[PDB]
């Protein structure tokens, strides 16, 4: 499926993100729109909290809110699981453990709906501290560069990823978010299962001065590396 998969991403692809979330019994929804340019490994997205203020810091949802837009160099094309699963797409599941705080469990469907790449997510957050960094909104509105370590999950016919996000805290400390990720294709067609490699992920967060709703503007650059 990789030949057709690659062809789906050679241009600029519209993106829709829909997240329904419940954190410590606080229900919220996020809607995101923008576009992806996999050739350049570039995402540009605008996210709105449609339900009110986000009950958690925007930066904590970045990983949850489309690794099919990663730039896989030609010499790594046989290691691109994400595109090879398209258009039928994949299920992306995570446990995100915040050190000394609560846990997110996420399930997402990532697939084409017509010419749009859609990320539809359910998130459940449990055991957050009422006056921790997360529910207290003491995380800086910024984002560090990270490596996403990818390994094949042959039994699942998919991939696993492990990485730790470092969230800057307003007091100059760091909040760690331990990410456990698994991806499973939805379709029956063949997918590429990769050799061990990583996604070099860079994220810039900004605000829209014209927007009254709680929101996040995101630019992301993602390149596959670690195979010579
Ligand atoms: Cu293929």
Author numbering: 0 to 64, 66 to 228
Publication excerpt:
As a proof of principle, we first tested the GHK tag on crystals of sffrGFP6, which is a surface-modified GFP variant that passes nuclear pore complexes 100-fold faster than standard eGFP. The engineered Cu-GHK-GFP fusion protein crystallized readily using diverse precipitants including ammonium sulfate and 2-methyl-2,4-pentanediol (MPD), and data were collected from these two crystal forms. In fact, for crystal form I in space group P6522 the structure could be easily solved using a minimal complete data set for this space group with only 30° of data, which prompted us to further investigate the phasing limits of single GHK-Cu sites. This structure was refined to 1.68 Å resolution and shows a square-pyramidal coordination of copper(II) ions: in the equatorial plane by the glycine amino N atom, the amide N atom of the glycine–histidine peptide bond and the N atom of the histidine side chain. At a wavelength of 1.34 Å (9.25 keV) the anomalous scattering from native S atoms is 0.428 e, which is much weaker than the more typical S-SAD data-collection energies (Cu Kα, 8.18 keV, 1.5418 Å, 0.56 e or 6 keV, 2.066 Å, 0.95 e; Weiss, 2017). Despite being able to automatically build the GHK-Cu-GFP structure solely from the copper(II) site phases, we compared the mean phase error improvement after LLG completion of anomalous scatterers with S atoms using the Phaser SAD pipeline. The differences in the mean phase error against resolution for refined Cu-atom sites, as well as sulfur LLG completion, before and after density modification with Parrot, are shown in Fig. 2(a) and resulted in an average phase-quality improvement of 5°. Here, the peak heights for the bound Cu atoms are 50σ and 70σ, respectively, while the heights of protein S atoms and ordered sulfates are in the range 5.6–9.4σ.
